[PDB]
Structures are given as C-alpha cells and as structure tokens.
Design a protein around this ligand. Structure first.
Ligand code: 296
Ligand code: 296
Ligand code: 296
Lengths: 525, 525, 526
C-alpha cells in the first residue's frame, strides 16, 4: 500500500500507483490534520472576509468580490469554465500519476479542503476510475486538472478502454454519488503542478531505467567487439573525476562486463601491441587500437552526466510531490497565505533539462549502432552485420535509418520553460509551460526506446555473427537471451519493423535490467 | 478523374485523390512512354552491365557486384530489409497522398519500371487499399516507401479501419495477385521524396485554407470590435508595398468586411476625433484610437508573409510532384543517369519554412483572442466576454489558456532540414530530414485549428454580447451562423472542451470559407 | 556610379555597391518633384490641425493623445530622442550604409511626405562618408536603429568613424554641415520602417549567393582531386528530370567549372572499368570501384540548389521591400491619409530566417566534404588526414577539421526569430517580426560558413599536391588552387593553422575565389 501523506511520497511510489495499480492510503494523521485546517478555514470563510478563489473572482477578476452564498456556484463555474483542454488524452497510467500527485498535495494539509475530497480521489485510484485528461491547455496545470476536478462532481469524462465516456454513467454505474464542491475545493483541485509533476515523475523514473538499459546493451556491445576495460576502472572516476553520475555508470559497467572472456585489460593490449612493434623503426603502423572510439570509451562521462541530470530532476520532483503546490494556503493562527506555489518553474526547468540529457543519451546510442554497422569501425565484423552474401543482402543497413532519424527528430525539440506568453489580461504575465516540458521529455524517452531497440538487435546480431556467445559474461548472456527470446538471429534479410517495435515495447517495460536482476545478482545503480 | 502523368499533377489534385477519394488515371501516353523506357532499359540489364540498384549492392555496398540471375531477389531483400519504419501509422488520407506522389513520379517515365507497377499502384488508390505506413524512419523516404512497396508484393501490412492487417489476407480477400519485383522495380518504388512530397502537399494545401479561415474570423472580429478599414485599402499594398501575399490578404479582407455597418472609414474616425478635441489645448486626451492595435491592423503584412511562404512551398511541391525523384534514371540513347534526385532538400526547406510561417499565423491568432478578451483592449466589451456576473463567472477566461499554450508549444518546434546525421557507413553523409519537416508543419497546422477554434468562438460570443449581429456584413453573418450552428452562445459558463474541439474539427474540414462560398460569392484568394 | 535611388528600381546589388564600395547615390529629379509636391499637399493638411498619426497625435499606444500643430518640431524631436535606446555592438560602416541607403530609397518613393531636404541629407551623408553609429540591438521589427540614424540628421547621437562612436555635432561642424530640424512627420518617417533588416539582409543575401558560388567552386576542385563522377551533373538529370531553378543553376556551374578536367571520370568509363573488374564466374563479387560517390560529392545540385532557391526568394522579397513605402501613415494624392502597418517586417523577417536555415545546410555539406577527404576510408586513396610525411608523428589537417565541425554545431543552435513576437507598448505592438534579429542570425551563419569553407579550400589544395594531381586539373581548378596557394603554402610538417585559416576565410568573405575564376577563365557563373 502506497502511503500518500504529502510528506514522504517518492517518484517510484508514484510509478507503482500509476503503472502497477498499487493501492493508495491516506494516513489518519493526514486525514485528521486535514479536517482541522478545514474546520478553522471554514470558520474564516463564514465571516465573508476576502479570500482568493473563495470569496473573489479568479485570476485577473480577483477584483470581483463574491459573497459566501455563492459558495458551491463559484467553485463549480470555475471547474467547468476551465475544463478547456484540447489535444490527445493522457494514457491511463499518466492520468493516475496526475491524480496521485494532486491527492498528495492536499494530503499535506495546507489546502483546507474537506477530507472527503482526498477520500474520493483515493477511491477513483483504488477503484480504477481514471479521468480522461487532454494533454494540451496547461500553461504550467489548470485545464488538465479541471478535467479531473470535473469527474469528482460527476461531470466531464472518464477514460474507459481508450475512449472518454461521460462521468455520469460511470459513476452511477459504480454506485458512487458525485461530490459537491465547497469553499476553495474547486480551486484546490486545479491549482497546482500536479500534471507536470505527475507525468514528470513517470518520465524521470523511466528515464533512469533507460540509462540502466543503455548501460546494459552498451555493455553487451563492448564485449561483442572485444573492447578495453580500462575506461571503467574505478581510479578514473571515484578518484580522478568524482561526478556522482559518472561514478555510478562506471560502477555499473564494471559489474555488467564482470567475468567476460571477450574484453581486454590494458596490460594485455599494451603487451600485444608492443609485441607487434619492430625496434628498428621510429614510427610504425599497427592494426591495434590501444583505446577504442569515444562511443565505446566515454560511456561513464556521457551517461554519467545524464544520470546527474536525472538525479537532480528526481530530487526536485520529490520535493514538489510533497509540497503544498496550491493557493491560497492555510496555517495555524497565521494570515491566509497568498503566494504562487502553483508556479511550475522548478519542474518546468527540471524536465527541460531531462529532455536535453535524454537526447544526448540517444545520440550516444545511435553512434554505437553506427560503430557496429560500419566495417571500418566494427573491429572485425562484416558490413552491416550481413550473414550471407553482402550487397545481395543489406542486413541491418536499413534498420539504422530510423535510429538516425530519431536523433535528428529529438534535436528539433526545444526547451519550453522559457516560452512563457502573457495571458488572462496580464495577471499570468509569467508562466512556466512545465507540462509541455514534461511531454517533451516523454517523447524523447519514447524515441530512445526505438533507437535502443535497434541497438539491442544489432548487438545480439553481432554476437552470433562473430560466434562469440560462449565468451560473453553472465550479464552479457542474460541480455542476449532476452533479445532472442523476442527476435531470432538475422539470416537472410526480412521485414524489420515488427522486430524493432517488439524490442522497443520490451524496453519500455524494463524487460532488460529485469533480465539482469533475475539472471544475476548484479545490483545496478 | 485526376490525371497522374508525372507532368501536370497539382497539389489540389493530390488532395482530391487523398481526401475526397477521387479516381486516378494513368494516361496512355504515360503508360506507353513507360513501356518503351522499360523495354530499352531491360535490354540494358540483360548485358549484365553495372547499374546501381539493379546489378550492385545498395548504398555503401554499391561495391558489391550482383549478377542478373538475382533480379527478383535483390529488389525484394531491399524492400524487406528497409521496411524498418517505426512510430505511429500515417492516416488513410496521408498514406494515399504518398502513394499518389510515387505513382506520379514513375508516370513521368524515367524510372524504367514495368507498366504494371504504375497500374497496380493506381488500383490500390482506386480500390481503397491503403498501405499502413509508419511515420518515422525516413532521412529524407526509404522506410515509409518500403512499407508501401511491400503491399505491392503482398507483404507488410495495409490500413484497415485504423489498424494494420497483413497484406496477404487483404489481397487474396479482394481477388488480387501480388506482384513480383523485377530489375530496379524495388529501388524505384522506395527511392524518392514521395513521403515528404505527399504529406507536404496535404499540409500546404490545408495551410492555405487555414490562412483564408484566419482571414475570415479576423474579419468577423474586426467588425465586432468596430475596427478601421484604412489598413486594408488597396493603395497601401498594390501601390505602396506590392508583396504578392500582402496584396492577396488585403484584397480578401476588403471583400470579407464588404458591406459591413459596424466598421469605420478613416474619414469618419478622423472627423469623430476632431470633433472631440477642444481648440484651447496643445495636448488633449481622447478616448478614441485613430488606429487599432497591430493584431487588428497589420493583418495584410503578417498573413501576407505567410501566404508568400505557402505560395513558394506549393511551387516547389508542384515541381517536385512532377519530377523524376528516383535513381538511377533512364533517357533516350543516353548513359544511365546516376545522380541524387532522391534528395529531398528542396522540400525539406520548403516545409521547414511552412512551419515557421504557420507558427506566426498562430501567434497572431492568439493575440487577437487576447485582444477581445481583455477589457482594456476590447474597445467596449465586458471582461472575458462574460454575459452575467463577472467574477462569479469567468466566461472565456479559461478558454484562452489552451490557445496561449499552443503558441508556446509550436515555438518548441525546430527546423529539421539542417539536422542531417551521417549514416550507412558514410555514403549518406548529407540528408535532408524532409519528412520530419513535413510532420512538423502538419503539427503546427493542427494546433492552429485549435487556436483558431477558440478565436471563432470568442468572436461569435463578442458579437451577441455587444448585440451587433444586425450590423455584421453578409460574410460576417455567414461566419457567425456557421459557429452557432455548432456551438450556442455562452450564457452561464460551462465545460468548454467539447465546444473547442467541435469548432476545431470543422476548421480542419474547411467548414468556414465553405460557408462564405455558399452564402456569398466572395471569391477568396 | 552613380546608383539611382528612386524608390522604384533599387536592387540588392546596387545597395551593396553603395554600402561596400562607396558607390555614389543620386536621387532623380523626378523623385524630388514627387517629394516636393507631396510635401506641399501634405503640409496643407497638417496645417489644419486634423488628426494624423504621429504628426498630430501621440505615438504607439499613446495615439489617444491629441497634439496641436504648434508642437510640430518638438513632437518629432522627442520621438527620435526617446526612441534612440539601442544597445549592444555598433554595426560596421557597410552595414550602416546599407541601412541608410534602404531608408533613403523608401522615402524617395514619394509616399512619406518628407521634404526633399531630408532625402538630400541622407544622400549627402552617404556620398560624403558620414556614417551613423547604429547599435545592433533593440528593434522589434526597426525603431531603435533608425532612431539613432535620425539622430545624426539633427546633430545629435553619434557617427561611426574608425570603429568608435563620435558625437555627431562635432562631426557636422568639422565638415560645415548645419544640422536639420525635423518638421511634420519627418522624425516618424525616418524611423518607422524595415530599413534595418532590409538594408542588412540585402548585404547578407548578396553575399550568401557569392558564398553559394564559392562553395560550388571548391566542391568542383575537390571532386576533381578525388576523381569523382561527372554523371551527377548531367543536364538531363535536372533541366528535364527535376527542374528546380536553383538545382539547374548549380548543376550548370559545376559542369562549367569542371570543363576540361583530365581527372574527373564519366559514368561510361566507370561501368566499363567495373565490368572488366567483374569475373563472369561468381554471381556476387566484391569490387573496390564505386560506380557512384557519397552524397556529399553527388547531391551537390539538389542541396546547393535548394539553398539557391531560398536565396532567390529572399532576394526577390528584399527587392520589393527596398522599393516599398515601408512607412506609416502614407500619402496618396487625392486620398485620405493611409493608416496601416507597412512598417511591419514580417515578409523580410521570414525571408532571413529561411536564409539562416539554408546557409546552415550549405555549411553542413561543406563540413562533410572536409570529413570526406580527411578520412582515409572515404578519401578514395589519399593519406590519412592529408599527412604528407609520417602520420601519427604528424597530424596534418586532423586539428583543422574541428573548428569546422564545431561551427556546424553552432549554426544549429541558432533558432528562427521571426516567430518570437513578445507583446509590448501597452499591447499596442502585440505582434511584431523581430526581422532584424533574423537578419543578424543569417549574417552569423554566413560569417561562420566562410570559416568552414576556408578549411575546405585548404584541404582541397592540400589534397592536390599530396596526390600530385595538379596537371590534370581543369582550367578553373588550377585557378582555384593557385588562388589558395597564393595565400597559404602547402602543408609539409605540422604547423600553427589558425592564421592560415583566417587568411583564406577573409579571402572568401570578399569574393576572392569567385574573382580568381572571373580573371583566369572564360567561365560565367550563375
Ligand atoms: N491559478 C489561478 C487561476 C485560475 C483560473 C484562471 O483563469 C480565470 C486564472 C488563474 C490563479 F489566479 F493564477 C491563482 O491561484 O493565483
Ligand atoms: N536511396 C538509396 C539507398 C537505399 C538503401 C540504403 O540502405 C542500404 C541506402 C541507400 C541510395 F543508395 F542512396 C541511392 O539510390 O543513391
Ligand atoms: N512605428 C510606430 C511606433 C513608434 C514608436 C513607438 O514607441 C512608442 C511605437 C510605435 C507605430 F506606432 F508602430 C506606427 O507608426 O504605427
């Protein structure tokens, strides 16, 4: 059971709830400190004092003073008039991630909403009622959250088997009476960064597994090509260049290739090469490379940088998930706080950063593909991994194209956290566009699975084309089995698409890294 | 019947074939000049002389010499090994546009393919057999076209009711015997810019109607706000600044507002304002604006620039549609041409340009929305077009958000025609990425319908909130009726999403501009 | 010599002549007469205190402020002063001249209602070398830049000399010129246009075309050094198969450039050589001969053609803008004052964003051709990285490739500007073009490409002597080579390259290589 207390929620906890449909539970302490705030706040609204969103207009119309007899109407008109989202609907797991992040915010107890709101949100999550949330509309997350707030009052639509069906039917069809929004209940449900923070959570969490899976195949590839282990020696990171991420990647690469009979140690290389030099010449030509190319050597540096960015992103997400990103806010014997904790800038940046990081992750992946496919760079393999007669057969030559195309496509994605456009009169003169940032990262993450899919296939192909299967380390054989369990070796050439999408979906499921855990005890960082 | 002769095909012709399922016909002259080339070429391949793609490997493996006894195998392995496309599948109309562009290329008669290939392509089009083409893979269009070439040989998949179903079943299920690829038939089917040129055609064609529809609502808006006609007077464009597009927009704006009882002439404004000035003061404050803001005045300039870009794009598309974008090429008593007319740079640029143009089109649209929604800029209308008690009701305040978000999202889309990444060894060291460019433009075009949808609704709303319906010109009333026929006036506020998507889909169908044609005889440029 | 600025026939080339080579400018008597007459009629209407934007009303959002004609000079003068708020680097002499030239031509069209004296002053400044100190930043597309120019017209602001800004007043006294006094609508007319982006973009587009030519020139030399196929440039493959204007031109320049080459090979020879290399026995055999070459040496017409097309479009747009009444409000005899927005630089803003993209790709192509010759696996028989002595010990051009590769990456970080409108001035300027930013972006890629091309010219020339293929070069290729070798010596032992590269880059920025061909061959390049 995932505890949603607005204090200890983690990115992984969110994923379990969103992807694995884990049960959520609001702690009595949270549900209790929520009723209290609600009790005091409610006594404050009875005195018809000025409170944004409770007894005033919304946004620029805050100058419009509204009397307390319009309690339910105000909150409702808001939710209905802001449910103006467009574009595609978020997937079931994405929608759940969003609802979880909102509940956790209210569960912190500073939103002064009735306990039943937290309860009802937790019910939808625990009962499988997913709001149909359109992806576009948020300026960083009113509209997306307005469609959520709708389902609670029996309006809008829910996501049933891929399509949106009126909340009304679904609710009555489940024996649930829609709620009625009281003072500041409508505003609290839609006033925050739950859309970007929810989606962001799923993306960063998955981004991390993609780095681990990038490491896994990169490892298989280095063994199949007989690369040097020198680049990953602890002294070069832990001691010489202590970037957290770099150390982690270097550590995973050493563990993944551990016990390989194909990789070479610097000592052996240096000795093999020295044995190849004649002493009567000042400058000789050797066919041996003491170091391999950047793509098979600078892995710790590049992927480590990626990790560092994903670590910083998860950090900001963790802080945000457990924050009172709502407005206005309530405290003990303190004036009602009128700020802007609904501003997603901290996450908008975080995700724009993740987009850049992941894009470089893909760049690196695609070049390794290029490296194994080019006969002048493969270090001994046949052109484009062709088994039979090259020319007549192209092998993986055609498979490289979609991977190269994706690197270019990912590069056309620009940062969104700086594209603020003034609206609502000029009240919202500076916004973050964070949900666009989150969606950008999601896309590059998705495209990276396709690039990686091509790499996983090329590697396995290079393995049984060089006949180096029996030399692969335990983790290397684990990865190889996992690919063949899905796609067989490439004899004559054939329709590639199905094979790529097959390995791609598996990658998005963490099928690899899951195979390493189940067939070793490599504990991957 | 649309004539596909590789010489006279137009962008609109393509749309009719793609969107309206118009019948296609290959002229006897084309089918005849095709058999001839085929006859001579075939006698050239019999002598087992070096011919790229016919008796050699593909791409970098061109050094692999292949004997003529491998005729069918070569072309086949190619189509199968390059069908490595990923991502979503193109829509039925997009796929048809692509097939049409390919057929038209071969119909030019320089590809030396058997007439039956042109015939079979024309059959799929005329019979409703649409190839399931994945959107990603092309480096600018092998993979996308490889999935097409597949269906002709009974492999791959076809697009049936939204999903991909094996070509085999569908073919046998229609009484069609799959073809067998001969010398250079596989290469010719996949070696060109048909993907980007096909999709590009649909996008530019629709882009032009979007400009016309931007003009239509912009016109309704200018009448509803009582704007000045001065900005559109012919002297200011035809004479002072003769940019083709600017003249066209200025001309459409004069025709659209024609006979309006709400707009003001400069003479009247100047007179009204002069009447408002006291003669005893050197500098007075007036509540009258002799000119309106840029968004309601610089329409000819901005939209005209858009038009110019779309005119140049259509031009390049027209030239390309009718070109032999295939390789190698055949001529009369001339060596076999070995060039690179498969390089989509001319279209890659054209579409990157369209992306920028359309993005500015949206920028302008959204600001007009902002203008009508802000009480300090509306020129007399209520805040956010609220009918009842503002504050209590937000009116269109929430509807502005998705439009503002879209301008920002469109801005995150970067040019693709410059993101070339070297592949296939280094044989393809400079590519165009044109299909990504086409897809970029498509997206901004799609987002523009949503922005425009919000504007069309705001305008109609501003009309019956100011009670200026009886003053609207004939075209203005035409547009207004068309909006209300879909969405009623906004009394109390309510769920906006359905209304926006409703006007959005209509916009993508050209429902407006169709209404102007049917309810006037405004001939819009 | 002298160029005629009649607001009707000015060309991008004429603008460059006035700007780059100090060509004398001359406003025709017909234009002066149209100006004098428009001014007299316009004056007669402004003299009646009727409302006219910027003449008897406030500016921008403050148009609601009605101003009496008794304030005629002050109004125009406060405008030019308060709007001279540009920041950043000052444009060079040639850029500032093109700007003033474009402004003079606009007013010379006759619909600005300016006194002929202003037309006279601007032309005086140009013909006498009085260059305004124009800050690059600060226009939204071009008030700030033009206001700094208008300033020097009234003895204020700064003039540029020796690269430093010098108080205008001093300069005018040191030349006998007496400052003007802005009258009705004169301050507004001087700053309310697209002269900033239009003048600058003209220089850029003109140079972009010369850069296209010089790219074709070096590409032709390279193709001959590595003995590529002439087949990709056969007329029938463009003029007939794919008639894209720019594509036809490039294909033609390449054919003219390689005419008379003993190094290039024809498709016929290739296949014959390839068939005699084939042995009747095996079905699939390996050959070391390439019937076709990499895209970088075969898709030149398609790619450079596209760049050309884009440039032809921008030059066309620029030509119309140069001869346009991009000002507001406007006077048309027998008509009410035109109140519009011809000051909006969207059309040019777009054009320049396109040139930036186009030139960026031109640079990508050059970059990969450099890579082509430096890679022993792709150079077709040349030594690694063009090392003449012992490799490893010497790197040759290994390091020269980096500044070029690094520049391709930099050009790709430059995004379109024409779509970046930010509402200002009380939402009155709610949609702008940022065209001058677009034009400076283009200038930047242009500038960067000269560096990429410089490394390519050095590499090609080096590839020639390393392979001892000088005697087989066509007439044009020998000219190109000697032009390079006249600046930089062949690369023997490794040496400092930075100076060798900046030397050829400068030669490229001034059309040196395009001139070598004009003076050494009978070739006419498109
Ligand atoms: N997020 C609030 C908001 C809600 C709805 C709206 O459209 C009318 C504009 C703003 C807020 F006003 F920004 C706030 O809580 O501060
Ligand atoms: N477009 C050709 C091509 C096809 C397939 C391929 O992958 C092996 C690489 C290239 C071409 F070789 F580029 C050509 O026709 O020139
Ligand atoms: N270009 C005019 C302008 C001048 C100065 C200014 O800043 C106050 C704003 C605008 C114009 F108002 F745009 C015009 O001539 O229409």
């Amino acid at each position: 059971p995932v505890s949603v207390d607005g204090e200890t929620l983690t990115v992984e906890a969110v994923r379990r709830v969103a992807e694995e449909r884990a049960t959520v539970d609001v702690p009595a302490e949270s549900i209790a400190k929520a009723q209290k705030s609600r009790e005091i706040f409610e006594g404050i609204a009875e005195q018809n004092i000025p409170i944004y969103g409770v007894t005033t207009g919304y946004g620029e119309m805050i100058y419009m003073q509204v009397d307390k007899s319009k309690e339910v109407e105000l909150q409702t008109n808001l939710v209905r008039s802001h449910s103006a989202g467009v574009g595609p609907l978020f997937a079931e797991d994405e929608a759940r991630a969003i609802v979880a992040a909102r509940l956790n915010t209210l569960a912190k107890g500073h939103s002064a909403v009735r306990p039943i709101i937290l309860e009802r949100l937790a019910q939808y999550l625990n009962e499988g009622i997913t709001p149909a949330i359109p992806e576009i509309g948020s300026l960083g997350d009113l509209a997306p959250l307005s469609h959520v707030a709708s389902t609670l009052i029996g309006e809008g639509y829910v996501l049933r088997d891929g399509r949106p069906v009126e909340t009304a039917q679904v609710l009555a069809e489940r024996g649930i009476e829609p709620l009625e929004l009281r003072f500041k209940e409508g505003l609290a449900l839609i006033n925050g960064t739950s859309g970007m923070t929810g989606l962001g959570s799923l993306v960063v969490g998955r981004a991390l597994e993609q780095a681990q899976q990038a490491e896994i195949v990169t490892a298989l590839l280095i063994e199949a090509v007989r690369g040097s282990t020198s680049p990953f020696l602890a002294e070069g990171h832990d001691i010489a260049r202590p970037h957290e991420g770099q150390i982690d990647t270097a550590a995973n690469m050493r563990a993944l290739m551990r016990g390989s009979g194909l990789t070479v140690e610097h000592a052996d290389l240096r000795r093999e090469l020295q044995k190849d030099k004649e002493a009567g010449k000042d400058v000789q030509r050797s066919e041996i490379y003491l170091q391999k190319a950047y793509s098979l050597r600078a892995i710790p540096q590049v992927v480590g940088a990626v990790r560092d960015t994903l670590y910083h992103a998860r950090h900001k997400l963790r802080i945000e998930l457990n924050s009172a990103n709502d407005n206005p806010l309530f405290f003990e014997g303190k004036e009602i706080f009128h700020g802007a904790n609904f501003h997603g800038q901290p996450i908008a940046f975080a995700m724009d950063f993740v987009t850049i990081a992941l894009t470089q992750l893909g760049v690196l992946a695609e070049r390794q593909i290029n490296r194994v496919l080019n006969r002048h760079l493969s270090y001994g393999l046949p052109e484009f991994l062709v088994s039979g007669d090259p020319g007549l057969h192209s092998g993986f030559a055609g498979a490289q194209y979609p991977a190269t195309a994706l690197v270019a496509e990912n590069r056309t994605i620009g940062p969104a956290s700086t594209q603020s456009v003034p609206s609502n009169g000029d009240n919202q003169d500076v916004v973050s566009m964070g949900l666009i940032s989150a969606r950008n990262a999601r896309r590059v993450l998705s495209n990276n699975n396709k690039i990686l899919a091509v790499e996983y296939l090329a590697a396995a192909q290079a393995v049984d084309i060089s006949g180096r299967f029996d030399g692969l380390s335990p983790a290397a054989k684990a990865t190889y089995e996992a690919v063949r369990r899905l796609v067989p070796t490439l004899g004559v050439d054939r329709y590639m698409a199905d094979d790529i999408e097959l390995v791609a979906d598996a990658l998005s499921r963490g099928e690899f890294l899951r195979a390493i855990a189940r067939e070793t005890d490599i504990q991957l960082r």
